[PDB]
Short mmCIF file of C-alpha atoms and ligand atoms in Angstrom, two decimals:
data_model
loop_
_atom_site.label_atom_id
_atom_site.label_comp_id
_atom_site.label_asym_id
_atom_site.label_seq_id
_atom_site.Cartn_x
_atom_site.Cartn_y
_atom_site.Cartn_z
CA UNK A 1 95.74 86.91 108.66
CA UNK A 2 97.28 86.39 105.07
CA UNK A 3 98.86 90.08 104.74
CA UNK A 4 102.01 88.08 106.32
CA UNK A 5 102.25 85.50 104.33
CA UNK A 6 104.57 84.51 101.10
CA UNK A 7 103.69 85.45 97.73
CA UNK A 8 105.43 84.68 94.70
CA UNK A 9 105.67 87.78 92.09
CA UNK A 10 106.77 86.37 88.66
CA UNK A 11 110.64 85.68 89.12
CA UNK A 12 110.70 86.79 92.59
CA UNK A 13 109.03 85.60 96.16
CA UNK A 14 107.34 87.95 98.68
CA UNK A 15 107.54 86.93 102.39
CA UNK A 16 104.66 89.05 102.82
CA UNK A 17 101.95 90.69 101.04
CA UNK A 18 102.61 95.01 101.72
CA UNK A 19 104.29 96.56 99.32
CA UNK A 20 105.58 99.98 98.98
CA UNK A 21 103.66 101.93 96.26
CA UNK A 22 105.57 103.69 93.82
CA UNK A 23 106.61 107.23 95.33
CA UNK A 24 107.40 110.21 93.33
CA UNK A 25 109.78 112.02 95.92
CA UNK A 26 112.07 114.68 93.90
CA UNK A 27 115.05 113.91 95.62
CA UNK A 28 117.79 113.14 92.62
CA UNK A 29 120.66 115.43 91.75
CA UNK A 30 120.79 117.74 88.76
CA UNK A 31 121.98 117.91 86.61
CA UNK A 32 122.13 114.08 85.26
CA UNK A 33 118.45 112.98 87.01
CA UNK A 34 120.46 110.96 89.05
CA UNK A 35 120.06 108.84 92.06
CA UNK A 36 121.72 109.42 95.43
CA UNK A 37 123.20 107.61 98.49
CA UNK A 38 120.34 109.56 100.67
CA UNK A 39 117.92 107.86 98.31
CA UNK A 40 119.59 104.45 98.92
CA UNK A 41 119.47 104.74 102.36
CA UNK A 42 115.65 105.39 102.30
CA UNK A 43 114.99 102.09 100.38
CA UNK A 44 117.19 100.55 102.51
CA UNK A 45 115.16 101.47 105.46
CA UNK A 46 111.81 100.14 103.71
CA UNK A 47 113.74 96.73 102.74
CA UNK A 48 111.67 94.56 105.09
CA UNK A 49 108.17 95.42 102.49
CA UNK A 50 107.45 92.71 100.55
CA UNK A 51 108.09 93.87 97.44
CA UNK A 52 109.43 97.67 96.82
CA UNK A 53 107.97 99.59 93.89
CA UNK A 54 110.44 102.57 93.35
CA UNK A 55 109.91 106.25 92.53
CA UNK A 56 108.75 106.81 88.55
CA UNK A 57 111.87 106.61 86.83
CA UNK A 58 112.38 108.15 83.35
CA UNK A 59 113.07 105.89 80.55
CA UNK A 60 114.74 108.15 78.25
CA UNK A 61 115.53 112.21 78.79
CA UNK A 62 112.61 112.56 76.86
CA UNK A 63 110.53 111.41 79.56
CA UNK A 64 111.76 113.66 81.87
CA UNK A 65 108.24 115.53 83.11
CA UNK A 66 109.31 116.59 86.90
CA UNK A 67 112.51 118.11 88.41
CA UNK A 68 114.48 115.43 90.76
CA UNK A 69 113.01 112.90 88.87
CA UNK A 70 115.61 110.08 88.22
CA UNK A 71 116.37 108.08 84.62
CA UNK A 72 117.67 105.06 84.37
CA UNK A 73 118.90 105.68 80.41
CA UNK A 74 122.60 106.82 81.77
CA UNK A 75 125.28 105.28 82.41
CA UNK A 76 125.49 107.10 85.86
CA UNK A 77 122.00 106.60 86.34
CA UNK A 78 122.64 102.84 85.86
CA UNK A 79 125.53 103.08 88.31
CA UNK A 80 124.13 104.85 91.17
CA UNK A 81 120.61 102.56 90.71
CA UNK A 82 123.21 99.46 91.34
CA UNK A 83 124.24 100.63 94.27
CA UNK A 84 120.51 101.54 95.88
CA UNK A 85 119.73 97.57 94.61
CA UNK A 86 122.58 96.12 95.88
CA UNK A 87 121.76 97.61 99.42
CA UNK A 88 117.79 96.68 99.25
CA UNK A 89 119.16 93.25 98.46
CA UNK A 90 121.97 93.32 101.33
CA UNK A 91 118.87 93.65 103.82
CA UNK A 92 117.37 90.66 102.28
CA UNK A 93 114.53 92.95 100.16
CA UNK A 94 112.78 92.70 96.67
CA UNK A 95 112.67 96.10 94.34
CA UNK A 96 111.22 96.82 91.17
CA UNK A 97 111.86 99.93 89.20
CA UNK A 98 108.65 101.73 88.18
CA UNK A 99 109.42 102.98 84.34
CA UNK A 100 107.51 105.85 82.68
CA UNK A 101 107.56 108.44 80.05
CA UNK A 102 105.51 111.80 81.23
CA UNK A 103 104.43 112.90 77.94
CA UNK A 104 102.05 116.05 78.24
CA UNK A 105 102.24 116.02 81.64
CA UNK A 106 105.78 117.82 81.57
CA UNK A 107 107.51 121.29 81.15
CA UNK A 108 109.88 122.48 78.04
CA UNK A 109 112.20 123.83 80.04
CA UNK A 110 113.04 120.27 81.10
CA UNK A 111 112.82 118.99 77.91
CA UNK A 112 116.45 118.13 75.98
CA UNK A 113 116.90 121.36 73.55
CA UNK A 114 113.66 123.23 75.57
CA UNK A 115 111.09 121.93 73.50
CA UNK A 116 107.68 121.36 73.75
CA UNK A 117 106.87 117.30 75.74
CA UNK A 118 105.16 114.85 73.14
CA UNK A 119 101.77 113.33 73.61
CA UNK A 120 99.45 111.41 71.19
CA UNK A 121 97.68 114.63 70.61
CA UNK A 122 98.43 118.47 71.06
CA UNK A 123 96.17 119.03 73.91
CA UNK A 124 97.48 120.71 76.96
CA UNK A 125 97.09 118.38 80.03
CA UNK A 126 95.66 121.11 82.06
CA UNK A 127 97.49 120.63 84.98
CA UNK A 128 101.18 121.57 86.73
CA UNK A 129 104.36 120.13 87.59
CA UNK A 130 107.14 120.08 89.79
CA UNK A 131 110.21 122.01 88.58
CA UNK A 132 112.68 123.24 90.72
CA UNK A 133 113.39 126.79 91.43
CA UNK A 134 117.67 128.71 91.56
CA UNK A 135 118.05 127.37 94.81
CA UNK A 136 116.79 124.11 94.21
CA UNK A 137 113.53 123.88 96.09
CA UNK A 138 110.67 122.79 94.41
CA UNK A 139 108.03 124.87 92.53
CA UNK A 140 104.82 124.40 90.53
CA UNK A 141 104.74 125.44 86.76
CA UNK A 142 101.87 124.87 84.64
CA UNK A 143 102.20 122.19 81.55
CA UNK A 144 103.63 122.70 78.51
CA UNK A 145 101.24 122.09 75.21
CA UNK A 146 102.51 119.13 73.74
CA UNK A 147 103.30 118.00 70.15
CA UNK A 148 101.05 115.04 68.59
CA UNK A 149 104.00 112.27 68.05
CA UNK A 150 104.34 111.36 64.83
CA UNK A 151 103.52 107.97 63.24
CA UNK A 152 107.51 107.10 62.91
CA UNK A 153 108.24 108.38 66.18
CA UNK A 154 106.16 105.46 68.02
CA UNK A 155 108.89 102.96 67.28
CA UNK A 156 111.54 105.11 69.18
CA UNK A 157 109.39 105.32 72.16
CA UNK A 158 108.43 101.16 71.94
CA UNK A 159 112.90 101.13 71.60
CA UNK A 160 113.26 103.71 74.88
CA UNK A 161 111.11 101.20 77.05
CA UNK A 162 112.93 97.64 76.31
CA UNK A 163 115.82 99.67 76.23
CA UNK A 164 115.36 100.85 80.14
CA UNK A 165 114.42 97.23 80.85
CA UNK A 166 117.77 95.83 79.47
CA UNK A 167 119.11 98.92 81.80
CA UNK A 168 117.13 97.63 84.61
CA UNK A 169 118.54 94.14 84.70
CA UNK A 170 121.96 95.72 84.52
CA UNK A 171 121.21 97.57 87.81
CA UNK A 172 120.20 94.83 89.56
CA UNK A 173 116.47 95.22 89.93
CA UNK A 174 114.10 92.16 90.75
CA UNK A 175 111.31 93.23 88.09
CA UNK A 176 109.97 96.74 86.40
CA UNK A 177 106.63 98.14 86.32
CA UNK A 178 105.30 99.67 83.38
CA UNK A 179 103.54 103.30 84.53
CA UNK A 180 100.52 103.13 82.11
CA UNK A 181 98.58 105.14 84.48
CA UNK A 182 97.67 108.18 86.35
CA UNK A 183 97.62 110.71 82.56
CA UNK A 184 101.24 109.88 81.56
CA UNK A 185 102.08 109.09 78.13
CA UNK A 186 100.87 105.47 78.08
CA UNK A 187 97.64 106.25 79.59
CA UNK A 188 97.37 109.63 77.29
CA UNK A 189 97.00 106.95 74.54
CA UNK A 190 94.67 104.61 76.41
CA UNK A 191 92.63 107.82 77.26
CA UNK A 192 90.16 108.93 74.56
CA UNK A 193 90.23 112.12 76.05
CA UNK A 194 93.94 112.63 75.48
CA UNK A 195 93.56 110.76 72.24
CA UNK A 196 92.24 112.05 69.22
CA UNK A 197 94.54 110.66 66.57
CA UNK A 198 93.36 109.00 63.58
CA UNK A 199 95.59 106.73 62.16
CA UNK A 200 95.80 103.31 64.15
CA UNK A 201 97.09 104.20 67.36
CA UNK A 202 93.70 106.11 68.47
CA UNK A 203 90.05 105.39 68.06
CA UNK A 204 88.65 102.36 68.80
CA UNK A 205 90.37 100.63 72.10
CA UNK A 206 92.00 98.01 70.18
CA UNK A 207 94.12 101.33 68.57
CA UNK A 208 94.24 103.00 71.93
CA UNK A 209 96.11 99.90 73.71
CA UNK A 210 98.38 99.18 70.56
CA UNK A 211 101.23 101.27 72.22
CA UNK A 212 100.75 99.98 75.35
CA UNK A 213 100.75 96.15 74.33
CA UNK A 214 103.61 96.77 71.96
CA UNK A 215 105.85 97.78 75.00
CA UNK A 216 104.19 94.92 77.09
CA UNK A 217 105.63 92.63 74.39
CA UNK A 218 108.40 94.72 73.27
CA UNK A 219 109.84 94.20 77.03
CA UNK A 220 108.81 90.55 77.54
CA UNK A 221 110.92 89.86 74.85
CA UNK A 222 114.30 91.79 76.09
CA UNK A 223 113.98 90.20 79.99
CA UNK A 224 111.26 87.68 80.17
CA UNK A 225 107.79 88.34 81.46
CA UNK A 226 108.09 87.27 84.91
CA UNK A 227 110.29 89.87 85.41
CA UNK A 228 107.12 92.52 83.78
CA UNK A 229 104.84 94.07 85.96
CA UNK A 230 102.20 97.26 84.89
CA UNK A 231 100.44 99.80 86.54
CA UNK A 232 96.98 101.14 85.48
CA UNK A 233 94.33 103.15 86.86
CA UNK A 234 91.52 102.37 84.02
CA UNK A 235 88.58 103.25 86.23
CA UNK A 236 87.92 107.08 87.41
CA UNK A 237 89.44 110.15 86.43
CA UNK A 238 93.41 111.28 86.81
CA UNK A 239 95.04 114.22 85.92
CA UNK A 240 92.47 115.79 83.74
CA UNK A 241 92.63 111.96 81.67
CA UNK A 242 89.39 110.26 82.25
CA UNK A 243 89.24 106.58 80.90
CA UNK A 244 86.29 107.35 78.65
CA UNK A 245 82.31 106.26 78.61
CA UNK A 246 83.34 103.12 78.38
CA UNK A 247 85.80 102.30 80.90
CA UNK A 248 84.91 99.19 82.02
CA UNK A 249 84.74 97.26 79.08
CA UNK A 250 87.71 99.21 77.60
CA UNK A 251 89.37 98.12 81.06
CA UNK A 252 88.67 94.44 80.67
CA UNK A 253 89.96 94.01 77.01
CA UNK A 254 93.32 95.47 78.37
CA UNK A 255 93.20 93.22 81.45
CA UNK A 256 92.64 90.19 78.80
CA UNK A 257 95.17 91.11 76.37
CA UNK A 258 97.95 91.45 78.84
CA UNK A 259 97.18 88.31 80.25
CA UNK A 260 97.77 86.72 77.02
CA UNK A 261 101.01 87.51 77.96
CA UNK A 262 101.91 86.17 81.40
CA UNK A 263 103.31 88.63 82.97
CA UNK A 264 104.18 88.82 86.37
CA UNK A 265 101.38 91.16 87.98
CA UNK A 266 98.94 93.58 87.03
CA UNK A 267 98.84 96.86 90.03
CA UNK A 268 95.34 98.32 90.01
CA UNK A 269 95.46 102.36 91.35
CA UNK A 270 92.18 102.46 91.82
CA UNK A 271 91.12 106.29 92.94
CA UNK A 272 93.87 109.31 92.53
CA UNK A 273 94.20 110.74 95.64
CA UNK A 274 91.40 113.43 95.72
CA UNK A 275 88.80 110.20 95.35
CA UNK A 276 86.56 108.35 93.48
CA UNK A 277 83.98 105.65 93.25
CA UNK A 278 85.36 102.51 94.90
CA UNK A 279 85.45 99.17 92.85
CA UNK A 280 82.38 97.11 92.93
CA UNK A 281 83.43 93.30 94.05
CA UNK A 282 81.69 92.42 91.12
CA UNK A 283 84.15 94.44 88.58
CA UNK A 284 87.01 92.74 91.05
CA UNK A 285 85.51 89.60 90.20
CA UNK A 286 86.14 90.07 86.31
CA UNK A 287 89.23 91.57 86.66
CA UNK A 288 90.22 88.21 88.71
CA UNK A 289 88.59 85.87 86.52
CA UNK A 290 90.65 87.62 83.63
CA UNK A 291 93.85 87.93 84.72
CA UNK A 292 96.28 85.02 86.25
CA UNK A 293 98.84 86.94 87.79
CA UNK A 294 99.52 88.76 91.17
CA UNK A 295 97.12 91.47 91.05
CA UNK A 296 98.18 94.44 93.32
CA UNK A 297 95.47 96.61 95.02
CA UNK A 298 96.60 100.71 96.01
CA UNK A 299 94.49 103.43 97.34
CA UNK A 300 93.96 104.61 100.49
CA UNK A 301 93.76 101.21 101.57
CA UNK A 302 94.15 100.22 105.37
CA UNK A 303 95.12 96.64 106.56
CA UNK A 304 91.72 95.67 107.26
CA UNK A 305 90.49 96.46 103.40
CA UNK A 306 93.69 94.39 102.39
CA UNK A 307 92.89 91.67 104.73
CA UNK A 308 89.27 91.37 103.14
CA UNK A 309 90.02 91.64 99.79
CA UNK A 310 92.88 89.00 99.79
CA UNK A 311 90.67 86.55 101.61
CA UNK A 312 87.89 87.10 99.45
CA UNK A 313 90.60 86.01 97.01
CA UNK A 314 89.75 89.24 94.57
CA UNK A 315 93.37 90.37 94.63
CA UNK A 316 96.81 89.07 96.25
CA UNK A 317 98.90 92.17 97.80
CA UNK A 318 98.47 95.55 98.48
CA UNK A 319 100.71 98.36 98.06
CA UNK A 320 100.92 101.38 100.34
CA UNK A 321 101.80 105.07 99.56
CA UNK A 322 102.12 107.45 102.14
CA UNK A 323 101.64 104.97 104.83
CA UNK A 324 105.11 104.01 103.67
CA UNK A 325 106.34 107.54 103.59
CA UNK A 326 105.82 107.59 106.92
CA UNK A 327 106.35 104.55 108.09
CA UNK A 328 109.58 102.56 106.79
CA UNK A 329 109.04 99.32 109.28
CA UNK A 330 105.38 99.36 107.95
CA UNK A 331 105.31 95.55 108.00
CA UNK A 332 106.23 95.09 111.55
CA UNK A 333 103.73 97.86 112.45
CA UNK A 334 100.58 96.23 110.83
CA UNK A 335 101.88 93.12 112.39
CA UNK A 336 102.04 94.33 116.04
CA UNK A 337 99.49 96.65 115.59
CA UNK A 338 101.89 99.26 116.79
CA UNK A 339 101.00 102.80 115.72
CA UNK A 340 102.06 104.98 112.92
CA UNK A 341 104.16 107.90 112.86
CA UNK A 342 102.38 110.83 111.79
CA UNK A 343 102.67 112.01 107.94
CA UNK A 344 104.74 115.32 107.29
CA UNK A 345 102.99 116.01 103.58
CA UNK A 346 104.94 119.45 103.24
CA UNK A 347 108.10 117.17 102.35
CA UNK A 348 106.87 114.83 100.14
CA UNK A 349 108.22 116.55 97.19
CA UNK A 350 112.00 117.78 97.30
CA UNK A 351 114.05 118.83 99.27
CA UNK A 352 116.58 116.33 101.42
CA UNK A 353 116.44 113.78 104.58
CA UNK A 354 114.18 115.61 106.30
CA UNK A 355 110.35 114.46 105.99
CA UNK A 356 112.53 111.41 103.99
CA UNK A 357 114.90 108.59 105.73
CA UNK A 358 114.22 110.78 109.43
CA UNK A 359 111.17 108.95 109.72
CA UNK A 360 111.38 106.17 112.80
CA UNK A 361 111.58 103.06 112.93
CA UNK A 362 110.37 101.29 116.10
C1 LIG B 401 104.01 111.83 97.16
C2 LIG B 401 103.41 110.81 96.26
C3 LIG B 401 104.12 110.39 95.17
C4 LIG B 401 103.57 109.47 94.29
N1 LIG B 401 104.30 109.03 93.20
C5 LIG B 401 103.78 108.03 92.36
C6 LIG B 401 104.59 107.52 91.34
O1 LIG B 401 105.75 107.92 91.17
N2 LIG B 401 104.05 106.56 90.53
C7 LIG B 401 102.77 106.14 90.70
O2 LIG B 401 102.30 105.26 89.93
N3 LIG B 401 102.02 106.58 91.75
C8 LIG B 401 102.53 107.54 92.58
N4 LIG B 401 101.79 107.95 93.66
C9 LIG B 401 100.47 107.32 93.91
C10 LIG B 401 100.84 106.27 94.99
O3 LIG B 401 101.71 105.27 94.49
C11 LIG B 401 99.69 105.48 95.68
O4 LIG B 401 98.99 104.70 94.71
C12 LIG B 401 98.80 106.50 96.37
O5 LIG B 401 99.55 107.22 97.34
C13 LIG B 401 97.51 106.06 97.08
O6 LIG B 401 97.78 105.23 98.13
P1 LIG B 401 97.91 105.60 99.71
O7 LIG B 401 96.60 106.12 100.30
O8 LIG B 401 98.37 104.30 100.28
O9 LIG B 401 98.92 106.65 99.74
C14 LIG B 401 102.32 108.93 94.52
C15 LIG B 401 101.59 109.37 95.62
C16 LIG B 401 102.16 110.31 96.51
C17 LIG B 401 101.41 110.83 97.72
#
């Protein structure tokens, strides 16, 4: 078995190689998108993974695309993450912040003033998302049309990113993970079905990863890139954003350009959660040979798949979703073989402790 065995992440070490999976969970107060002690106490629970990935967590008010979504632009925000780090790290855990901007995929009555979400283009993602109703629960609203950004307005969002990554040392985190997946606004821009712009941030895939890559670098240079991790899910459809006719070459030029910049680890989502084709070993193979990092496997993966795929040496750790939902002594479970506790899916999204830290451990 190497599933239970050390790993070291960029700046940080992993005593074992299951991670929690980021986890949208719609659980912050409003107003201020902030985080609570109920959420701390949930991480805290999950300490013993070996590497937490938090909840998507807004860069900038902007970002804001889901109600009970947390920032981490305040300085409240900043305050209350401290204190959900500072416990992780009390129980001897690692935690990186997952950092996104939403773009289309959002609502204006979320928005700051009520406007419309930005995107690279005006195209309507299609899809819903969570708001929350007068009595707080949560609801489904379709998306908002977006507005195209403008030229001048890329810089800002480049500034909101290394901004939240200065933020995120402050509170204490061990690394962040760029979201550049699953149709939010970095992927919208990867996507050439979410990106019809013309000047040279869409087109060819050299202009389609420019925004990405300038983050990349534009938050290696505030913190330092062992601290840098990204998530992508370049192969398959998500959200309505497909990766294009293309995708696997388009995925492998990303995969070489961010290596050219040493960051800590590259997380591969490789189906959303409705399905898709699985990875051939072969495209695992040049993703490997390209990339000289930690490279993080998720999708309904079980032990076993994670077992084979680390000791075929195609990638290092795995993370876990709603395994971990359920499940917040996951590690000592897979290592006994004990059983799971059964998923509650109705309380994923919103609401408070229950289907959330009421969850046994064993
Ligand atoms: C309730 C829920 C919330 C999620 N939130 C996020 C998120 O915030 N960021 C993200 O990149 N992926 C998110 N995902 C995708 C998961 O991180 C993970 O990749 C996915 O659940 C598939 O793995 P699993 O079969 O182990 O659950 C979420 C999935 C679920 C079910």
């Amino acid at each position: 078995e190497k599933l239970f065995t050390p790993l070291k992440v960029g700046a940080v070490t992993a005593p074992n190689r299951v991670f929690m999976a980021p986890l949208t969970r719609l659980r912050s107060i409003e107003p201020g998108d902030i985080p609570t002690p109920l959420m701390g106490e949930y991480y805290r629970q999950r300490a013993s993974a070996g590497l937490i990935i938090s909840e998507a967590t807004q860069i900038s008010a902007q970002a804001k695309g889901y109600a009970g979504a947390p920032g981490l632009h305040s300085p409240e925000q900043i305050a209350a993450w401290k204190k959900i780090t500072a416990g992780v790290h009390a129980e001897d855990g690692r935690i990186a912040v997952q950092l996104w901007h939403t773009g289309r995929a959002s609502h204006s009555s979320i928005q700051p003033g009520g406007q419309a979400p930005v995107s690279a283009s005006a195209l309507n993602a299609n899809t819903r998302t969570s708001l929350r109703d007068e009595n707080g629960n949560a609801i489904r609203v379709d998306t908002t049309t977006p507005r195209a950004l403008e030229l001048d307005e890329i810089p800002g969002i480049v500034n909101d990113f290394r901004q939240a990554v200065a933020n995120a040392r402050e509170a204490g985190f061990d690394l962040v993970e760029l979201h550049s997946a699953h149709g939010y606004l970095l992927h919208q821009f990867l996507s050439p079905s979410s990106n019809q712009r013309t000047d040279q941030y869409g087109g060819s895939v050299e202009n389609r990863a420019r925004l990405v890559l300038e983050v990349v670098d534009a938050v290696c240079n505030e913190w330092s890139a062992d601290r840098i991790g990204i998530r992508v899910s370049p192969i398959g459809t998500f959200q309505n954003v497909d990766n294009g006719p293309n995708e696997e070459a388009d995925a492998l030029y990303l995969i070489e350009e961010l290596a050219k910049r040493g960051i800590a680890y590259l997380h591969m989502s490789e189906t959303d959660l409705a399905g898709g084709k699985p990875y051939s070993e072969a495209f695992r193979q040049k993703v490997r040979e390209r990339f000289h990092g930690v490279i993080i496997g998720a999708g309904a993966y079980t032990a076993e798949k994670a077992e084979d795929l680390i000791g075929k040496g195609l990638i290092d750790a795995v993370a876990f979703g709603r395994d971990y939902i359920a499940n917040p002594d996951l590690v000592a479970r897979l290592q006994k073989k004990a059983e799971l506790n059964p998923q509650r899916p109705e309380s994923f999204y919103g609401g408070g402790a229950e289907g959330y830290t009421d969850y046994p451990s064993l």
